[PDB]
């Protein structure tokens, strides 16, 4: 159901990714994996689109 979009992220990096996805009507989850940083999840359907916006905005910074 929920596929794993990015991982190994800073907290601010994570937030910006979620912001940019939210701005394009994709809802994402931020997941704290402690020493491994945050990861970003979306819903399978939104994967292609989410990858598009992350390329487009050149995320993560």
From Swiss-Prot:
Gene Ontology cellular component list: cell outer membrane
Give from-to of the shown chain within the full protein: 19 to 79 of 252
- Tell me the organism: Salmonella typhimurium (strain LT2 / SGSC1412 / ATCC 700720)
Function as written in the Swiss-Prot or TrEMBL entry? Required for invasion of epithelial cells. Could be involved in protein secretion.
Task: Report the locations given in the UniProt record.
Answer: Cell outer membrane
Q: What is its main location?
A: membrane
* Keyword annotations from UniProtKB, A to Z: Cell outer membrane, Lipoprotein, Membrane, Palmitate, Protein transport, Signal, Transmembrane, Transmembrane helix, Transport, Virulence
**Record gene name:** prgK
- Tell me its family: Belongs to the YscJ lipoprotein family.
GO BP field: protein secretion
Q: What is this protein called?
A: Lipoprotein PrgK
Keyword DNA repair carried by entry? no
Q: Which domain of life is it from?
A: Bacteria
